[PDB]
Amino acid sequence: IRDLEASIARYKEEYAVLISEAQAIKADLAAVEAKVNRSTALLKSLSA
Amino acid sequence: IRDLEASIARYKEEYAVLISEAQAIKADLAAVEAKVNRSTALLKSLSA
Amino acid sequence: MVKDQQEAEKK
Amino acid sequence: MVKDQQEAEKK
């Protein structure tokens, strides 16, 4: 039972690390999508 | 059992959001700590 | 979560 | 993790 609790806690902090890098890539995706929308509007105007 | 499972899943969702803002806070704290060490060295030299 | 898991194991 | 917590609660 002590080993089970220790494994639960350990994988809890590795889960925290995984969700931390998940938020990092979420921010990266948001920045990329905003840049793509901005460039697409620019491309529409410059095509016109 | 169904109500317990639904409450557990809602807890998973809100806990994931809490984790998201938690490592947002943690990354902010790490960046602040680094920039404060740098600014402390800079301001001690600039006062001297 | 610990209380919920204990309740599920009991029932 | 939920499965392991349930197993720990059972045992």
From Swiss-Prot, chains C, D:
Disulfide bonds: none
Compartments (UniProt record): Cytoplasm, Cytoskeleton
Note on domains (UniProt): Dynein heavy chains probably consist of an N-terminal stem (which binds cargo and interacts with other dynein components), and the head or motor domain. The motor contains six tandemly-linked AAA domains in the head, which form a ring. A stalk-like structure (formed by two of the coiled coil domains) protrudes between AAA 4 and AAA 5 and terminates in a microtubule-binding site. A seventh domain may also contribute to this ring; it is not clear whether the N-terminus or the C-terminus forms this extra domain.
Function noted in UniProt: Cytoplasmic dynein 1 acts as a motor for the intracellular retrograde motility of vesicles and organelles along microtubules. Dynein has ATPase activity; the force-producing power stroke is thought to occur on release of ADP. Plays a role in mitotic spindle assembly and metaphase plate congression.
Disease the record associates with this protein: Charcot-Marie-Tooth disease, axonal, type 2O: An axonal form of Charcot-Marie-Tooth disease, a disorder of the peripheral nervous system, characterized by progressive weakness and atrophy, initially of the peroneal muscles and later of the distal muscles of the arms. Charcot-Marie-Tooth disease is classified in two main groups on the basis of electrophysiologic properties and histopathology: primary peripheral demyelinating neuropathies (designated CMT1 when they are dominantly inherited) and primary peripheral axonal neuropathies (CMT2). Cortical dysplasia, complex, with other brain malformations 13: An autosomal dominant disorder characterized by global developmental delay with impaired intellectual development. Some patients show signs of peripheral neuropathy, such as abnormal gait and hyporeflexia. CDCBM13 is associated with variable neuronal migration defects resulting in cortical malformations.
Family in the record: Belongs to the dynein heavy chain family.
Oligomeric and partner information: Homodimer. The cytoplasmic dynein 1 complex consists of two catalytic heavy chains (HCs) and a number of non-catalytic subunits presented by intermediate chains (ICs), light intermediate chains (LICs) and light chains (LCs); the composition seems to vary in respect to the IC, LIC and LC composition. The heavy chain homodimer serves as a scaffold for the probable homodimeric assembly of the respective non-catalytic subunits. The ICs and LICs bind directly to the HC dimer and dynein LCs assemble on the IC dimer. Interacts with DYNC1LI1; DYNC1LI1 and DYNC1LI2 bind mutually exclusive to DYNC1H1.
Protein's name in the database: Cytoplasmic dynein 1 heavy chain 1
Organism name: Homo sapiens
